[PDB]
Amino acid sequence: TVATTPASSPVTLAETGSTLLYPLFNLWGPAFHERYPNVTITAQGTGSGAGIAQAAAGTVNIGASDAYLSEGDMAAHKGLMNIALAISAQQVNYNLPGVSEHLKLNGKVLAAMYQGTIKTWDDPQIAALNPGVNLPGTAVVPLHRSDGSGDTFLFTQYLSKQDPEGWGKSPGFGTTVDFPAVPGALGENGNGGMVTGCAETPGCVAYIGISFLDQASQRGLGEAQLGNSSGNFLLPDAQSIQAAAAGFASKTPANQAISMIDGPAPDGYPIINYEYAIVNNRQKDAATAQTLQAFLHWAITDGNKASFLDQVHFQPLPPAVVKLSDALIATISS
Template sequence: MTQRSLHARHRAPRLALLAAAGLLAVGSATAATLTLNETGSSLLYPLFNLWVPAYTKANPEVQINTASTGSGTGIAQSIEGLVQFGASDAYLSDAQMKKNPEMLNIPVAISSQMVNYNVPGLNNVHLKLSGAVLAGMYDGRVRYWDAPALKQLNPGVALPHHLIVTVHRTDGSGDTFMFSQFLSFTDKTWEQKVGYGTSVNWPAVQGAIGANGNPGMVSAVRSTPYSVAYIGVSFQNQTQKDGLGEAMLQNRAGNFVMINKKTVPAAAAAMVPKTPKDERISMIYAPGAESYPIINYEYVMVKATQPNAATAAQIRKFLSWAVSTEGGNSLVFLKQVNFLPLPASARALTLQQINQIH
C-alpha cells in the first residue's frame, strides 16, 4: 500500500465524522454564507420578497430571511438585536431614540396608504372621505353610511342606511401609525382622545373588526359588507382584484385626491426637502393642491454597531444596493408594489446613515 493511499485510508473516517457532525462545509460558497434576518412591516414585506431573490442570486455569499410580522415587531426585534433588519412604516419616536441611540432609521423607498371599503353597489364609486369624517367613523361619532357628514361630502350618491363596520390592525403596525397620524392631524377630538402610534387604544365601536397585517385587512373588508379599512398601497393590486372601493381623501388644501402618478410625488416633493439628517419625519398631510395626504418613508431599522465586521459589511452592501436606482430602487421592483424611489437628496442622507453601520 502506498503512503498516499494509507493517508487517504486514515483520513476517510475522520471526514465522515466531520460531515456527520455538520462541521464540514460543502463547497467554499457554503462555508462563506452569512445569514441576515428581516422582520416587520407587512407593507414593506412584498418589496423585500422581490429584492431578496434578485440580490442573493447575484450575491450567493449571503442568505436573507424575511417575515411579515408588523412594524411593531420589526422595531422591537431590531432593537433587541434578534434581527438585522427591522422593517417599519413608522420611525422611532424621540423617547425610543433616547433609550436606543444606537438605532438608525433608514428610508429605502416612499409608500402611501389607501382607504378601502366594501359598500354593495358603490365599490365602483370613489367615495370622498376626509380625515375628520374617518375619525368619526372609527370612534363612533359617524355610525351610518348615510350619516349627514358623509352625505355632505358625497352629494348625489345614494348612500345606504347601514351601520359602518370599521376594520383596524390588531398587531403593532406602521399602517396604524400612518392612519392614526392622519386622523390626529385632521381631527382635534381624535388627537386628544386617541392620538397616534403603531398601536392605539381603538374606541369601542359597535361591530368593529380587528385584523392582522395588510393581508388580514384585505380579507376582512372583502368578506364584510359595509366595512371600511386602511390598507398599504403595496396591496393595491389585490384590493382592485377583489373589487373593493378606494376613497378619494381630502388633502390639506381641501381637495379630494387619489393615489396616482401626480399626487404621491407632489406630497413627496413638499416633504422630502424637510427631511432631517436622521430622516425621522412624518410626511402625513403634506401641503399642496395635488398632494396625497397619507404618504411616508418606508424604513429599515438597523443597529449602528454590529457584532462583527463581516455582518456590518454585508448589511451596508445590501442596503446600498436596495436604495440604488440600478438596484432595489429600480422601477422594475418599485412599480410592482406601487412605491416611489427615494429622491436624490433623501438617498444621499440614507447613504450617510448606511455608512455609519460598523
C-alpha cells in the same frame, strides 16, 4: 464611505416587520441573493411594531417599519436608526358592493366613523362629500389593526392632523392606539387581515397599505379619495405620492425621522411615508456590517428602479434623501 459590494463569505441578513414593505422586500432579497449567492436574506411580514422590537433586541438585522423611531425609542436603544428605503402610501378601503364611485372621505369624517358618531354609510357627513352618489343605509364597521402596525401609525397621524381637537386629543397616534370600542369594530392581523376582514362584511372600512391595493381591488373593495389640507380629494398614484413627498424632500432631517402625513402640496396625497430599515450601528462582525451596508445601499439604488417599485405602487427616494440614507448606512460598523 458606503460599501456597495457585500462580503464574499457566507452572511445571513434576517428581516422582519412591516407587512406594507414585505411584498417589496420579498423582491429585493431574492434579487440581491441572485447577484451575491453567499448572502442569505430572509424576510417576514409581522408588522412595524415587531420590526422595531426585534431589530432593537437584535434577533434580526433589519426591522422593517413604516414608522420612524420615537424619541422614546431612540432613548431606549442607541445604535438604532431608521434608514429610509422608499416612499409608500396607504389607502382607505371599504366594502360597499352597490357603490361604483371612488368615495371622497377626509380625516374628520373618518375620525367620526372610527369614534362611532357616524354609524351609517348614508350619513349626511359622508353623503355631502359625495353629492350625486347613492349611498346605502349600511352600518359602518370600522376595522383596525390588532398588531403593532406602521399602517396604524400613518392612519392615526392623518386623523390626528386633520382632527386635532378630536382624534388628535384622544386617542392620538401610534403604532398601537386605543381605538374607541364602537359596536361592531374588529381588529385584524396584518394588511392581509385587513383585506380579508374588510372583504368579509359589507359596510366595513379599513386603512390598508398600498402594496395590498391590488389584492383589495381583486376582492371587490372600494378605494377612497382622501382629502388633503388644501381641500382637494385624491387617489394614491405615482403623481399624487410624488407631489406629497416633494416638499418634504428638502426638510428631511439627518436622522430621516419625519412625518409626511397631510402635507401642504395641493396635489399631494395625504397619507405617504418613508419605508424604513430599522438597523443598529453595530453588527456582529466586519463581514456582516459590510454586507448589510451593501444590501441597504443596493436597495436604495438598484432596488429603487421602477421595475421594483412599480410592482407595489411605491415611489423612489429623491436624490437628496438617498444621500441622507447613504450617510446613515455608512455608519454601520463592528
